[PDB]
């Protein structure tokens, strides 16, 4: 249950590799740092959505809740881009 807090490092590192030129290396500590950063990205946004849910006595955090939290927390670009993806998923 403790390990639940962080996304798997191998997957994170794989995305990092694709974000860099073929000749680049990534330090052990950079992979671990990124794993922690992206894991916090989920928890930070989720917490915002969760509290709004609790306050409204709602039980389910849905897609709109994530987008709303994203814009509230200053990730407006993520919210706008992912709104596209959400509506497509629901059609």
């Amino acid at each position: 249950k403790e390990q639940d807090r962080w996304l798997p490092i191998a997957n994170v590192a794989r995305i990092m590799k694709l974000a860099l030129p073929e000749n680049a290396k990534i330090a052990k500590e950079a992979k671990e740092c990124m794993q922690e950063c992206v894991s916090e990205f989920i928890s930070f946004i989720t917490s915002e959505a969760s509290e709004k849910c609790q306050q409204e006595k709602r039980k389910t955090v849905n897609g709109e809740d994530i987008l709303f939290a994203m814009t509230s927390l200053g990730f407006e670009n993520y919210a706008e881009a992912l709104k596209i993806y959400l509506s497509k998923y629901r059609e």
């Binding site: 995305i15 994203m70 596209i84 959400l86």
Partner: protein, 117 residues
């Protein structure tokens, strides 16, 4: 503007590249023919991160799906932003300090102050 975060704290060629990456992301997300099964990060692990928060109850399948996409973008853009500092030091190895430097360029990353002091 809604797109201010795309190049906040960036200049020159780095600015153009991150902007172009975001345009690539947007065009991809506008695409049809999405496979909602295949992701670089497993939906189950994303959901587990969410559920680590005792305040969270039920989670719609939509939420991990959105995070799967958002997290890919987050890792990619932060990695690209960090790479600028590696290249500025004429290094081919990305280090933790490069990520730290990238974070300090935009207040969008302030939420990571305890993760990367």
């Amino acid at each position: 503007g809604t797109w201010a975060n795309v190049n906040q704290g960036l200049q020159g060629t780095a600015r153009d590249i991150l902007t172009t990456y975001w345009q690539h992301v947007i065009n991809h997300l506008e695409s049809d023919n999405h496979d909602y099964k295949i992701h670089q990060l497993p939906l189950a692990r994303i959901k587990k991160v969410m559920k680590a928060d005792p305040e969270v109850k039920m989670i719609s399948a939509e939420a991990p799906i959105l995070f799967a996409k958002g997290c890919d973008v987050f890792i990619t853009e932060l990695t690209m932003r960090a790479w600028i500092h590696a290249e500025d030091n004429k290094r081919r190895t990305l280090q933790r300090s490069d990520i730290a430097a990238a974070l300090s360029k935009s207040d969008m990353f302030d939420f990571l102050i305890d993760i990367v002091p």
